[PDB]
Tab-separated table of C-alpha atoms in Angstrom:
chain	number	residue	atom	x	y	z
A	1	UNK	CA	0.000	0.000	0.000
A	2	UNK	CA	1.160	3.478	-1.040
A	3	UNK	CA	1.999	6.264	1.456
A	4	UNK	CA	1.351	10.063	0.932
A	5	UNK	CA	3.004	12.083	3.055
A	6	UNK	CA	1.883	16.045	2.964
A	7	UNK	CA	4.626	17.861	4.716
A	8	UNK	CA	4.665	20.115	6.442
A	9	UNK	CA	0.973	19.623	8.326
A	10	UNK	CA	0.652	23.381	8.144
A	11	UNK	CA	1.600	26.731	6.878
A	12	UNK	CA	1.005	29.976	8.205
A	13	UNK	CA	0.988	32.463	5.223
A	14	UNK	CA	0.187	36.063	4.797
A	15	UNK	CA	-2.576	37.088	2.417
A	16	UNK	CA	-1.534	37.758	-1.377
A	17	UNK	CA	1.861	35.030	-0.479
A	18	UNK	CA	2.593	32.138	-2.735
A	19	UNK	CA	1.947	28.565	-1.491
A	20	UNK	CA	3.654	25.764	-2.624
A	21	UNK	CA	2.494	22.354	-0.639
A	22	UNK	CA	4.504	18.619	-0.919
A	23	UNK	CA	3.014	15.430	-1.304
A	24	UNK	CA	5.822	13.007	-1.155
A	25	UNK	CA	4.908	8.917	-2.216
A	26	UNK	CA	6.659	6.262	-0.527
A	27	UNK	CA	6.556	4.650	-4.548
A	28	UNK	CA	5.987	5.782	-7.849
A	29	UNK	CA	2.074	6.942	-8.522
A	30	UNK	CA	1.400	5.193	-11.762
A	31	UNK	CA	0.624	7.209	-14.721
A	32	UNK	CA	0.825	10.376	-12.258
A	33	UNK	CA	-2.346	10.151	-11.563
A	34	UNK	CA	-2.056	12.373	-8.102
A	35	UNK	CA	-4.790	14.608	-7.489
A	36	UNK	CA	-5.325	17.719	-5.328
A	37	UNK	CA	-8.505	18.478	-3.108
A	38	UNK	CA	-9.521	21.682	-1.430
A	39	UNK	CA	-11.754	21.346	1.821
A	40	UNK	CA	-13.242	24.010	4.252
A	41	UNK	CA	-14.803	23.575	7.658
A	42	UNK	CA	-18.306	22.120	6.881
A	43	UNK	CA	-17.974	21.685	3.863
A	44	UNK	CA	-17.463	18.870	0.832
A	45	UNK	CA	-14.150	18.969	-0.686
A	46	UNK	CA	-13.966	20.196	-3.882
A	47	UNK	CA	-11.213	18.793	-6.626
A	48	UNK	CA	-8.864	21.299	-7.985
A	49	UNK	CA	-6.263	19.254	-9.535
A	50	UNK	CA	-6.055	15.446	-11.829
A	51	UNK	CA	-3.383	13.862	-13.445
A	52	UNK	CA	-0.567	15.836	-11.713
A	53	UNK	CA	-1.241	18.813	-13.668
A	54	UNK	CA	-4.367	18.765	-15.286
A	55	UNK	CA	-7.227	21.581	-13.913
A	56	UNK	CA	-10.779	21.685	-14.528
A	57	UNK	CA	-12.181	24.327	-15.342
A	58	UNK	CA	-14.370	26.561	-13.157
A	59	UNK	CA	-11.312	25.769	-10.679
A	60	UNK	CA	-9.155	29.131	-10.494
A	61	UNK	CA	-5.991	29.537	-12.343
A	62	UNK	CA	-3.961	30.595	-9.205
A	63	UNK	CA	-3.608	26.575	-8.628
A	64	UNK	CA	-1.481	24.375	-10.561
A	65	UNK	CA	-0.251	21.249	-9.986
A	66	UNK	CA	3.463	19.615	-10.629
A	67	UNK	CA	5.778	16.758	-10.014
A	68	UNK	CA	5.640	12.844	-11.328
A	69	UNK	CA	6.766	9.848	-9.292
A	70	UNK	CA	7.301	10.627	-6.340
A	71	UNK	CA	7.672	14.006	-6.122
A	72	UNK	CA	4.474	16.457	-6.575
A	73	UNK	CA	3.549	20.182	-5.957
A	74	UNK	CA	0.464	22.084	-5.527
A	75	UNK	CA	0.963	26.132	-5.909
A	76	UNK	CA	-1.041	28.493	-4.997
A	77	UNK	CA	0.238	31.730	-7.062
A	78	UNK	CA	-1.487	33.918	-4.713
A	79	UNK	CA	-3.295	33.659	-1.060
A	80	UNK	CA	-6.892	35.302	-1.846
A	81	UNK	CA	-8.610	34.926	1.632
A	82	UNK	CA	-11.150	31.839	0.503
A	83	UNK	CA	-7.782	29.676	-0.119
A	84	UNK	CA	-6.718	29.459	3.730
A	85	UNK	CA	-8.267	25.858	3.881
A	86	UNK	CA	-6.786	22.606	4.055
A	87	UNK	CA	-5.643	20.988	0.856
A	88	UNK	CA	-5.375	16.982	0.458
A	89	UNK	CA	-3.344	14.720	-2.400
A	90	UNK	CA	-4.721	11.532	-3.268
A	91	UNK	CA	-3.516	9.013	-6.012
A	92	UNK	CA	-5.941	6.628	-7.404
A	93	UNK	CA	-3.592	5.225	-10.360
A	94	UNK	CA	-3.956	1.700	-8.608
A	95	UNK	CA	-7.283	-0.234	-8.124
A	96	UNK	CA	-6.621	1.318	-4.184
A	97	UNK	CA	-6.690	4.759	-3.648
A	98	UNK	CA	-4.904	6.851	-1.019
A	99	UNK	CA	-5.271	10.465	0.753
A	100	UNK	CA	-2.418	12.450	2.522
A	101	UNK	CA	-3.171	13.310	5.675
A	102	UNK	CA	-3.589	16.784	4.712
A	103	UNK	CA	-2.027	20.435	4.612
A	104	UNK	CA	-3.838	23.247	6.589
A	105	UNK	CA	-2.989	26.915	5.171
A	106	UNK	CA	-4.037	29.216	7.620
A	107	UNK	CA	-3.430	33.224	8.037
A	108	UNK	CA	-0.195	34.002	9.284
A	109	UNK	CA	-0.361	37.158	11.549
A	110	UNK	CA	1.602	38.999	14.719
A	111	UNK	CA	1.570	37.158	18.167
A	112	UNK	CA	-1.615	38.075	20.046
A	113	UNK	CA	-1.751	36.464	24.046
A	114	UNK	CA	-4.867	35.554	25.175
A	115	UNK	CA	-7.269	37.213	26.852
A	116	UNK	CA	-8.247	35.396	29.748
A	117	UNK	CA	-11.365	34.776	31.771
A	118	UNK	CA	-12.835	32.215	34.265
A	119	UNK	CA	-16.158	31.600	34.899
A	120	UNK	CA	-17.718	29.459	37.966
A	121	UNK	CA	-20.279	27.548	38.424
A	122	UNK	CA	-23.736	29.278	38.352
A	123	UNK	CA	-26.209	28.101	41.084
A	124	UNK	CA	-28.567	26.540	38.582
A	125	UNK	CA	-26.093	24.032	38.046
A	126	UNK	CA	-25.339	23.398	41.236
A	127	UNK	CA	-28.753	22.578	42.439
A	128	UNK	CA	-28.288	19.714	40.121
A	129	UNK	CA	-25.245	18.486	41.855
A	130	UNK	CA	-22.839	19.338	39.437
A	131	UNK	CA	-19.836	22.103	39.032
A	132	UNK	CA	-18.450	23.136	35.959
A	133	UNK	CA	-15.744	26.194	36.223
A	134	UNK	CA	-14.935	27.753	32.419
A	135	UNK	CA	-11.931	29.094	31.364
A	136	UNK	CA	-11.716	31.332	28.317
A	137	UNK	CA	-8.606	31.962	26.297
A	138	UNK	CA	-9.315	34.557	23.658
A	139	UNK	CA	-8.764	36.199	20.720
A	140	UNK	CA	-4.515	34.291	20.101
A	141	UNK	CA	-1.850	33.641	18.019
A	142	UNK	CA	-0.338	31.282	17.530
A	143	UNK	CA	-2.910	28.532	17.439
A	144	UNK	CA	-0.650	26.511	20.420
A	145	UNK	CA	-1.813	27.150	23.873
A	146	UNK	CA	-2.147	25.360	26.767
A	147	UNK	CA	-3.942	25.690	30.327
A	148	UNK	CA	-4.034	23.398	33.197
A	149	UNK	CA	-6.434	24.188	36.400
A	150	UNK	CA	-4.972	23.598	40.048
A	151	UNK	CA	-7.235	23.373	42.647
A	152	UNK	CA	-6.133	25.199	45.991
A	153	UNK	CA	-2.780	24.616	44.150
A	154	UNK	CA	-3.321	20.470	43.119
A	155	UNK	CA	-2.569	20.134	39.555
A	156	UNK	CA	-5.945	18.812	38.022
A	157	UNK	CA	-5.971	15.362	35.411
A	158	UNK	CA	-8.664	13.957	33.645
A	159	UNK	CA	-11.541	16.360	34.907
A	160	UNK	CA	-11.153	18.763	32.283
A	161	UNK	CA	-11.954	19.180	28.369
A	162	UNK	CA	-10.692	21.798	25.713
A	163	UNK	CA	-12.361	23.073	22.678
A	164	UNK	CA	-10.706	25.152	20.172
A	165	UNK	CA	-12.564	27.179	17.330
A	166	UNK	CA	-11.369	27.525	13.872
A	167	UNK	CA	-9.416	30.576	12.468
A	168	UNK	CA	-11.302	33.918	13.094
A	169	UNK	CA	-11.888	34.986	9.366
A	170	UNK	CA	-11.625	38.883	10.584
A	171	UNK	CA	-9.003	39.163	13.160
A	172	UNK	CA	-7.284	35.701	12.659
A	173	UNK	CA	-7.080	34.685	15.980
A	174	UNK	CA	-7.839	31.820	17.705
A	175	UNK	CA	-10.030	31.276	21.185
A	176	UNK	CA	-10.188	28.131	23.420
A	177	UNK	CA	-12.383	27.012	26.033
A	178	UNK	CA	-11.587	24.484	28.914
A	179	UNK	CA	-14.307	22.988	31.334
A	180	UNK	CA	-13.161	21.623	34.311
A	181	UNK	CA	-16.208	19.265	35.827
A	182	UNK	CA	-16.790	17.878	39.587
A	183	UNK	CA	-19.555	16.761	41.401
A	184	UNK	CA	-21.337	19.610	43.847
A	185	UNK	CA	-19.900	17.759	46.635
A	186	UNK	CA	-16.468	17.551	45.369
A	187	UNK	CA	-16.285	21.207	44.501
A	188	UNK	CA	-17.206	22.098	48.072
A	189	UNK	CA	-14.026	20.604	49.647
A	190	UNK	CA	-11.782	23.454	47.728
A	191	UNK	CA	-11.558	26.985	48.354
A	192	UNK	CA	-8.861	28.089	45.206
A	193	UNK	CA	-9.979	27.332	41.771
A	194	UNK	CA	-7.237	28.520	39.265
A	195	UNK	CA	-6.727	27.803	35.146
A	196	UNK	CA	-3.444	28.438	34.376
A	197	UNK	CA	-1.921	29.918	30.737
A	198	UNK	CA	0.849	29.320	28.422
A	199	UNK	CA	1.751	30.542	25.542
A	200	UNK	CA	3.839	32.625	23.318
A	201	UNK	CA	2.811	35.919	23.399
A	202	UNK	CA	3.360	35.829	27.308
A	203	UNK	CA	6.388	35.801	28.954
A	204	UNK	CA	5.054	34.345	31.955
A	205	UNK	CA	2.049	32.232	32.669
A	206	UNK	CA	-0.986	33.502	33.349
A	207	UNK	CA	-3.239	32.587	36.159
A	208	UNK	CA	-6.520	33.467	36.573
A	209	UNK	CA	-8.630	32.286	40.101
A	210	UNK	CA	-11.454	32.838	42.437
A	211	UNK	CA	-12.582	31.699	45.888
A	212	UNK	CA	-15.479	29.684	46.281
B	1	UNK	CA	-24.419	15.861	-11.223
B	2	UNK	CA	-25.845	16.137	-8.099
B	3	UNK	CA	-25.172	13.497	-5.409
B	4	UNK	CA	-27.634	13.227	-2.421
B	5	UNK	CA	-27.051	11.075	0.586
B	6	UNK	CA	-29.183	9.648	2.599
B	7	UNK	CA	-29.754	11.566	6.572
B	8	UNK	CA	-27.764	10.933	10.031
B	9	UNK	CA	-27.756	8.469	11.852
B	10	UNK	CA	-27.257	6.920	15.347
B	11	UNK	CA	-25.833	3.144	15.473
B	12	UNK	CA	-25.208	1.126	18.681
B	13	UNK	CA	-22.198	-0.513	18.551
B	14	UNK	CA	-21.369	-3.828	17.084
B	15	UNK	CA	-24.062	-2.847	14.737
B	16	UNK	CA	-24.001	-2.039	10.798
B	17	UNK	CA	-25.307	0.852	9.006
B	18	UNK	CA	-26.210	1.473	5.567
B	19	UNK	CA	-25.753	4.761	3.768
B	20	UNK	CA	-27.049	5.236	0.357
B	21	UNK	CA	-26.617	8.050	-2.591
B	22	UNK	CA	-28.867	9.105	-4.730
B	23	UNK	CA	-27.345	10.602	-8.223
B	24	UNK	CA	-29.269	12.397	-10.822
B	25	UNK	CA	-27.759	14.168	-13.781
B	26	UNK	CA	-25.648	12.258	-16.518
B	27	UNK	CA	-24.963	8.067	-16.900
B	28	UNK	CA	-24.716	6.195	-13.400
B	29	UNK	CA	-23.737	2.616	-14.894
B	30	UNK	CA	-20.485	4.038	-16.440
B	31	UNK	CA	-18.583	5.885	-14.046
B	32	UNK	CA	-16.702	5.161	-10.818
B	33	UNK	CA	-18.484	5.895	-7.315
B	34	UNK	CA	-16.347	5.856	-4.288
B	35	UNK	CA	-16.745	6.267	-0.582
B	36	UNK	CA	-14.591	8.529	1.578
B	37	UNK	CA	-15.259	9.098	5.444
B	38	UNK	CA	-13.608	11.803	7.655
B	39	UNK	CA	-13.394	11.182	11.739
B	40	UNK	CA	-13.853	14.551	13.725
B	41	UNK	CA	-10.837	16.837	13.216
B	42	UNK	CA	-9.185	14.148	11.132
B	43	UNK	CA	-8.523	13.688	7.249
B	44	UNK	CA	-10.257	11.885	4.402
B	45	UNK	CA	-9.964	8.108	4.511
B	46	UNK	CA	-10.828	6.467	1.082
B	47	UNK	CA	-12.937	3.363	2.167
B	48	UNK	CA	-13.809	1.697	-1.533
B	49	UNK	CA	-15.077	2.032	-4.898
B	50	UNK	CA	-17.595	0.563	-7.396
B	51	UNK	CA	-18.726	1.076	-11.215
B	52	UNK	CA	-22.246	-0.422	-11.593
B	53	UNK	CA	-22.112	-1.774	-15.282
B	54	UNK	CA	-19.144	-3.826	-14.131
B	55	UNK	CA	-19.961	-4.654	-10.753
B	56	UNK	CA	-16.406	-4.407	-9.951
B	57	UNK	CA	-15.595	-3.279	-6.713
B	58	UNK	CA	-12.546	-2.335	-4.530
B	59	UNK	CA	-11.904	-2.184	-0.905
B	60	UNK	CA	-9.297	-0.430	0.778
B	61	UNK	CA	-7.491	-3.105	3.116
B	62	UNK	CA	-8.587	-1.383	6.530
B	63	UNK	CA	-12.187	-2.535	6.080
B	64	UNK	CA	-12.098	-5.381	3.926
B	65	UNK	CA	-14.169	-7.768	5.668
B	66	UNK	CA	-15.983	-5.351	6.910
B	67	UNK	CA	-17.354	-3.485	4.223
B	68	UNK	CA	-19.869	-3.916	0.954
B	69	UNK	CA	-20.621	-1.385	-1.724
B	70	UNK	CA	-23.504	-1.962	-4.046
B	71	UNK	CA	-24.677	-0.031	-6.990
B	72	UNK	CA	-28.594	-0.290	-7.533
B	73	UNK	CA	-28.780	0.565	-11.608
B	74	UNK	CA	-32.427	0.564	-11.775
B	75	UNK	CA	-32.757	3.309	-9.236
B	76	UNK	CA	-29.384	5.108	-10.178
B	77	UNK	CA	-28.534	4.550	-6.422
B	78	UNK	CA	-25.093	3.574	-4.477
B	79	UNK	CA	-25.194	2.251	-0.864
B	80	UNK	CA	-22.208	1.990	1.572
B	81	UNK	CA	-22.565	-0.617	4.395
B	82	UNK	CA	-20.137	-1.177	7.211
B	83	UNK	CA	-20.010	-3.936	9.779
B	84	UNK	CA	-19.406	-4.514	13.279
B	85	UNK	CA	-19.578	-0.755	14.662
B	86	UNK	CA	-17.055	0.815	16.984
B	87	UNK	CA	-16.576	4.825	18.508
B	88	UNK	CA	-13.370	5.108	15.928
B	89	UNK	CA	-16.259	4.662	12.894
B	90	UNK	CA	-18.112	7.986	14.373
B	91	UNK	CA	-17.597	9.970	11.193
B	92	UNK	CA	-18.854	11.952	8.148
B	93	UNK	CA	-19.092	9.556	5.355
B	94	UNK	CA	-19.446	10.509	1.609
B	95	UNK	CA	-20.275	9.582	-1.752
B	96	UNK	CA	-17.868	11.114	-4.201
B	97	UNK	CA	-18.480	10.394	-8.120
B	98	UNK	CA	-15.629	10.948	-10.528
B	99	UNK	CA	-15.451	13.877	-12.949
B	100	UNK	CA	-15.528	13.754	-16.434
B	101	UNK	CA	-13.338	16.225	-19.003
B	102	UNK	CA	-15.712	18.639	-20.969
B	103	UNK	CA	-19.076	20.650	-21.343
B	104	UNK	CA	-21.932	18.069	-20.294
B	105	UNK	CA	-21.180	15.032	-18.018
B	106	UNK	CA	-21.133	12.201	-20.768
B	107	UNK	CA	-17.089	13.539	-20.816
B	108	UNK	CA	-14.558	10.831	-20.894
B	109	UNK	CA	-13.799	9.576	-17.087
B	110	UNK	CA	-10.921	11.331	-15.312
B	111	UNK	CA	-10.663	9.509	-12.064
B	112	UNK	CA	-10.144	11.746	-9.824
B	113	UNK	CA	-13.246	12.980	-7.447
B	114	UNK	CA	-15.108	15.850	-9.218
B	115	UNK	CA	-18.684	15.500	-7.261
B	116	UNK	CA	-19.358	14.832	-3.876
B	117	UNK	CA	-22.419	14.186	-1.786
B	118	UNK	CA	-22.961	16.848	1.302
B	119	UNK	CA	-21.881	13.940	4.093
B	120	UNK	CA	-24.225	11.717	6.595
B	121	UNK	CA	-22.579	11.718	9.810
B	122	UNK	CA	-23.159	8.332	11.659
B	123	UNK	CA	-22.497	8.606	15.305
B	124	UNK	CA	-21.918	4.972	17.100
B	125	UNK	CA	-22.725	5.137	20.579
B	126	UNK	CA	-24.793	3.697	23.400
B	127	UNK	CA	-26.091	6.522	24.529
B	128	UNK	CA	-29.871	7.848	24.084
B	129	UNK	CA	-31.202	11.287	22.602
B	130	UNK	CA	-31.237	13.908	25.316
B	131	UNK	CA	-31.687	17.547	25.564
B	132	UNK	CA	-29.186	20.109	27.131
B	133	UNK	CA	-29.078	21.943	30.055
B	134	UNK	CA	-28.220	25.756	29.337
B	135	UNK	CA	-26.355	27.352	32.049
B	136	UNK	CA	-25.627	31.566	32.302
B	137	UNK	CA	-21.754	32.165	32.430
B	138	UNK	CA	-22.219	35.268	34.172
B	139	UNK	CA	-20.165	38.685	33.566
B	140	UNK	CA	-17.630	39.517	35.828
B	141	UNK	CA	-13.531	47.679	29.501
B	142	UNK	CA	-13.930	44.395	28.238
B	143	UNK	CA	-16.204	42.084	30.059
B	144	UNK	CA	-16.784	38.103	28.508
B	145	UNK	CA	-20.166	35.641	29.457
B	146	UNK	CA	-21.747	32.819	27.928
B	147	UNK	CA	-24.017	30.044	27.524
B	148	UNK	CA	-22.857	26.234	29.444
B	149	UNK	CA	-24.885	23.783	26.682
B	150	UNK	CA	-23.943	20.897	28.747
B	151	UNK	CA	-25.127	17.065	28.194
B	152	UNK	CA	-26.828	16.793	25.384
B	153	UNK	CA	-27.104	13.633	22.294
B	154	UNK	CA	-26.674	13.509	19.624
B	155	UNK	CA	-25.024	16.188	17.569
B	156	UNK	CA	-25.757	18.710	16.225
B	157	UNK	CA	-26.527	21.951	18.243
B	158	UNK	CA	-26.406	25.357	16.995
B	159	UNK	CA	-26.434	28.398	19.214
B	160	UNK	CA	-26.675	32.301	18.504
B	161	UNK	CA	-27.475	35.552	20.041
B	162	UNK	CA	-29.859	37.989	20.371
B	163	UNK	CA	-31.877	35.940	17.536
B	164	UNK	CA	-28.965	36.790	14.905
B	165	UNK	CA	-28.449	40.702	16.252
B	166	UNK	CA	-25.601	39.859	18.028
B	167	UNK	CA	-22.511	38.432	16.049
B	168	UNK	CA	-19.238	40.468	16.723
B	169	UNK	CA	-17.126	38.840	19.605
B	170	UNK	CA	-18.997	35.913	19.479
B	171	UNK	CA	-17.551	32.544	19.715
B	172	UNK	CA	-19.104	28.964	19.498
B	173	UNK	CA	-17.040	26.563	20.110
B	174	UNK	CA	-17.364	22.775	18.595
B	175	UNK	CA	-18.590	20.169	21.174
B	176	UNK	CA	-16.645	18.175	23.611
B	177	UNK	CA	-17.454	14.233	23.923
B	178	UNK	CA	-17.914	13.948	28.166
B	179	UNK	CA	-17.305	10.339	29.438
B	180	UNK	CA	-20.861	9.465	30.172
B	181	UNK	CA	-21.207	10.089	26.106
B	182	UNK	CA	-23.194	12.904	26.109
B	183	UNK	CA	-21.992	15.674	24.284
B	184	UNK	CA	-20.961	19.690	25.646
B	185	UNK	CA	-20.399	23.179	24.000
B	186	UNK	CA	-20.475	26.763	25.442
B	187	UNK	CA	-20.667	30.060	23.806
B	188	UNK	CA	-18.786	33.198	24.536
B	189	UNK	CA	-19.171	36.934	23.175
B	190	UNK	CA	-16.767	39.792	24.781
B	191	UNK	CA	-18.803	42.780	24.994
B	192	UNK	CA	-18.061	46.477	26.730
B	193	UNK	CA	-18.267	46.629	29.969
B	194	UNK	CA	-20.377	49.521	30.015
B	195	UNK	CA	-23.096	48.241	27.756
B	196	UNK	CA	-23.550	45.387	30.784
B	197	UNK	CA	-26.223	48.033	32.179
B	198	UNK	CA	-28.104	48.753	29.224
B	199	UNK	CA	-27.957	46.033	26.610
B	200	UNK	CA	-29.643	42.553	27.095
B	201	UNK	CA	-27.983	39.051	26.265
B	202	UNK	CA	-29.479	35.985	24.963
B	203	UNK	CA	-28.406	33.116	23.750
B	204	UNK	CA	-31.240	31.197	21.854
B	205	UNK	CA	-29.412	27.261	21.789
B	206	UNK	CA	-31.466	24.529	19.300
B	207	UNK	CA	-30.940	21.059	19.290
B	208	UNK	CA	-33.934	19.643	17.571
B	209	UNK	CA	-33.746	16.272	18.184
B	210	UNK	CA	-34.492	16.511	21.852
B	211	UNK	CA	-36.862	19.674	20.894
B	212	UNK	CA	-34.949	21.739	23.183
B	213	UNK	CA	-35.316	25.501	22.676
B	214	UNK	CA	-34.034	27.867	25.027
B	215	UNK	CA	-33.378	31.326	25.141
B	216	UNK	CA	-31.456	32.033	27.838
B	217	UNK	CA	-30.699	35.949	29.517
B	218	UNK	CA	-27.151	36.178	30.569
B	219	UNK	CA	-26.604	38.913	33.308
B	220	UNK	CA	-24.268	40.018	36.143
B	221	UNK	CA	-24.300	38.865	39.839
């Protein structure tokens, strides 16, 4: 079975740049028949390249496709603001076809830290017995971040969950949201509920708390 | 062309599902229908392929064994049907018909995937359909609250604000899988903090299986 590998996984480019995205086969696609797919978050993907090099038309000139072999390349001549999307190879010269896992283009832009807030639990909730504490990280670049909650200084594991949205089409930034979950009773034996933030664009981590 | 799959669907596991795809527009005996499926956050796996004059079919090693792919020519109709469900299968699955290479689509076959159907996402899972709980994630120039949309099944569940009037700063994020299997998702918006006193905040949350439709005032305090 043939291997695609699409590396690297992603590229941060500025609007108007030029793109040019590997797919590498571990052996020769026969009769270079490589294509290229374009895919955008809830959507079909949509195929913008066949036979290597061959475009259909209705699909935009700024995309052409090279290579044989082993060797291909997908160019994007210039970044209009629909293109930041993830772009897949596939071959399909066999009775087998394969995908790449896949090259994300997204907008590259300064280093923004988070804003962050935490939320607790709202006494609705905790009638029910439950206690979720929110922490929002928003509005950053780069797309890496990381928090971790300590409770009255205990690093918390495997009571928390993290959600991160795509790429802001205006600003480009990112936001996350962790939820950190115990029972009502458990959440009454702690006074110091803190999320705790990492990431580029600060120096130092960032901790945001209350008191119970 | 126009490929139209068949609607979502919940599967225990160990189970099988069938999906099927309806095409209308140009000659379904002649050309090459394959089946691609995408996990959540993950890329496209190719799964097989069929061409219905032929009957010939391929399967992609992974799920041989556990896979069949019949083309119906009397109905112009292809079906996908996978075996012996697990949590990993919990995915968007489509249809994807290859393109042909001029005006019309009785062109000569070019392999690659031109046409694709719009995805049926088959969630396997034990659990049963269940509306949300909405919980207020109260307000403290720049102040942040939400909307907790906490244990809810199956996907999906869209939120907004305001009934649509409130966009800017708003952020919905996709849903977290908890471990009893129910599903969670909040909404934020960052507002100013002096507009906490004389603007109102609502977030209207729908998930229609479980008819649940909330819309919920966010305030201080």
């Amino acid at each position: 079975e043939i291997v695609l590998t699409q590396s690297p996984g992603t590229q941060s480019l500025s609007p108007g740049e030029r793109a040019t995205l590997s797919c590498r086969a571990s052996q020769s696609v026969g009769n270079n028949k490589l294509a290229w797919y374009q895919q955008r978050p809830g959507q079909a993907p949509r195929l913008l390249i066949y036979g290597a090099s061959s475009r259909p038309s209705g699909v935009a000139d700024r995309f052409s496709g090279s290579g044989s072999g082993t060797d291909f390349t997908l160019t994007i001549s210039r970044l209009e603001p629909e293109d930041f999307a993830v772009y897949y190879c596939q071959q399909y010269g066999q009775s087998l076809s394969t995908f790449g896992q896949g090259t994300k283009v997204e907008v590259k832009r300064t280093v923004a830290a988070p804003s962050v807030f935490i939320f607790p639990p709202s006494d609705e909730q905790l009638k029910s017995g439950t206690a979720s504490v929110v922490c929002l990280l928003n509005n950053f670049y780069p797309r890496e971040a990381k928090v971790q909650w300590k409770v009255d200084n205990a690093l918390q594991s495997g009571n928390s969950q993290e959600s991160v949205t795509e790429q802001d089409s205006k600003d480009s930034t990112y936001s996350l949201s962790s939820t950190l979950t115990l029972s009502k009773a458990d959440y009454e034996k702690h006074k110091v509920y803190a999320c705790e933030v990492t990431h580029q664009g600060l120096s130092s981590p960032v901790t945001k708390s209350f008191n119970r | 062309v126009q490929l139209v799959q068949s609607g979502a669907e919940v599967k225990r596991p160990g189970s099988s599902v069938t999906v099927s795809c309806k095409a209308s527009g140009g000659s379904f005996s002649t050309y090459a229908l394959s089946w691609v499926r995408q996990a959540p956050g993950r890329g496209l796996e190719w799964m097989g392929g069929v061409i219905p004059l032929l009957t010939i079919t391929n399967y992609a090693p992974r799920f041989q064994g556990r896979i069949t792919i019949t083309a119906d020519r009397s109905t112009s109709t292809a079906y996908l049907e996978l075996n012996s469900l697990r949590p990993e299968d919990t995915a968007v699955y489509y249809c994807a018909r290859e393109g042909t290479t001029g005006w019309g689509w009785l062109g000569k076959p070019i392999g690659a995937f031109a046409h694709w159907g719009q995805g049926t996402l088959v969630t396997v899972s034990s659990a049963s359909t269940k509306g949300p709980s909405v919980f207020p994630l109260a307000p403290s120039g720049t102040a942040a609250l939400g909307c907790l949309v906490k244990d809810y099944f199956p996907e999906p569940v869209t939120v907004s604000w305001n009934s649509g009037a409130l966009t800017s700063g708003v952020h919905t994020f996709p849903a977290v899988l908890q471990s009893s299997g129910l599903y969670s998702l909040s909404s934020v918006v960052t507002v100013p903090s002096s507009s906490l006193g004389t603007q109102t905040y609502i977030c209207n949350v729908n998930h229609k299986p479980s008819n649940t439709k909330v819309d919920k005032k966010v305030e201080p305090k």
